Amino acid sequence: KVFGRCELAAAMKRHGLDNYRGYSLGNWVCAAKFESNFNTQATNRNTDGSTDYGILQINSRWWCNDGRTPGSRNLCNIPCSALLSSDITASVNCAKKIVSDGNGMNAWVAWRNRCKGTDVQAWIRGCRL
Ligand SMILES: [Br-]
Ligand SMILES: [Br-]
Ligand SMILES: [Br-]
Ligand SMILES: [Br-]
Ligand SMILES: [Br-]
Ligand SMILES: [Br-]
Ligand SMILES: [Br-]
Ligand code: NA
């Protein structure tokens, strides 16, 4: 499923992401846009053999199990396929654990490179919230 911008904002807000760990709602919508283009079915292989999954491109090296990343951990205790549902609950709960591990949203390289320090409010502008 390809969310719309204001649709994903409201879905993130309902799952308690707005201002989670100090990060306003626009940061998370921006991060989803540049990691997945709002597509819950997005996947991308990394050079090391791991794969990134779902609307927030969560990495199989650390966070989920896909059965083909030798020596990885499964810290969210979840199969990576659960991160590809049209319901974003599993993705949101795993993001809350990632963003609390010490490096904040710098864990998402596109956030650091394309969202950090920008007018992130523009991403929720005009949405009925
Ligand atoms: Br957009
Ligand atoms: Br594995
Ligand atoms: Br394979
Ligand atoms: Br583990
Ligand atoms: Br949802
Ligand atoms: Br932080
Ligand atoms: Br914002
Ligand atoms: Na893993």
Q: Which two tokens stand for residue 109?
A: 């390289």
**Residue 38 near residue 54 (C-beta atoms within 8 A):** no
Q: Which two tokens stand for residue 95?
A: 């993001």
Residue from 38, 16, 37 nearest 25 by CA: 16
- Ligand 8 centre to CA of 50 (Å) is 8
- Ligand 6 centre to CA of 115 (Å) is 14
Q: Which ligand number lies closest to the CA of residue 6? A: 1
Distance CA 116, CA 88 (A): 23
Q: Which ligand number lies closest to the CA of residue 78? A: 8
- Ligand 6 centre to CA of 126 (Å) is 27
Residue 7 known to be catalytic: no
Binding site for substrate, by residue number, is 101
Query: CATH fold of 5-124, please?
Result: Lysozyme (1.10.530)
Q: Which two tokens stand for residue 36?
A: 């997945």
Distance CA 78, CA 105 (A): 21
Distance CA 107, CA 75 (A): 15
Q: What is the resolution of this structure in A?
A: 1.9
The catalytic residue among 52, 66, 87, 119 is 52
Q: Which long-range contacts (CB under 8 A, 24 or more apart) does 100-109 make?
A: 100/21, 104/21, 104/22, 104/23, 105/23, 105/27, 105/31, 108/31, 108/35, 108/56, 108/57
- Ligand 8 centre to CA of 62 (Å) is 5
